[PDB]
């Protein structure tokens, strides 16, 4: 048997898409030369004999 | 002191993607068949041609 054949398919598509996104982000910047700041709590004591 | 400023970032992301799609298609088919046949018996021989 000797069968020939020939087809032609014509198509079309429509589409929707609803994309909802919630993004959480956190960042911690630092400078190695200026990491900390200081503060002293100090008093002055006179154990002498004359005031200054 | 090395005046170098470094930073680290951590990020989390959750995405919900809801998608729709639809389609149609239309196919058109032509076909041309052939055939030949030779039959043989004790005393009966035939032949056949088809398309």
Numbering used by the authors:
A (entry chain A): 323 to 374
B (entry chain B): 272 to 322
Please quote the authors directly.
Following assembly, the anthrax protective antigen (PA) forms an oligomeric translocon that unfolds and translocates either its lethal factor (LF) or edema factor (EF) into the host cell. The toxin functions as a binary A2B toxin, with enzymatic A factors, lethal factor (LF, 91 kDa) and edema factor (EF, 89 kDa), and a cell binding B factor, protective antigen (PA, 83 kDa). Within the endosomal compartment, the acidic environment induces a conformational change in the PA, resulting in the formation of a β-barrel channel that can insert itself into the endosomal membrane. The first α helix and β strand of LF and EF unfold and dock into a deep amphipathic cleft, called the α clamp, which resides at the interface of two PA monomers.
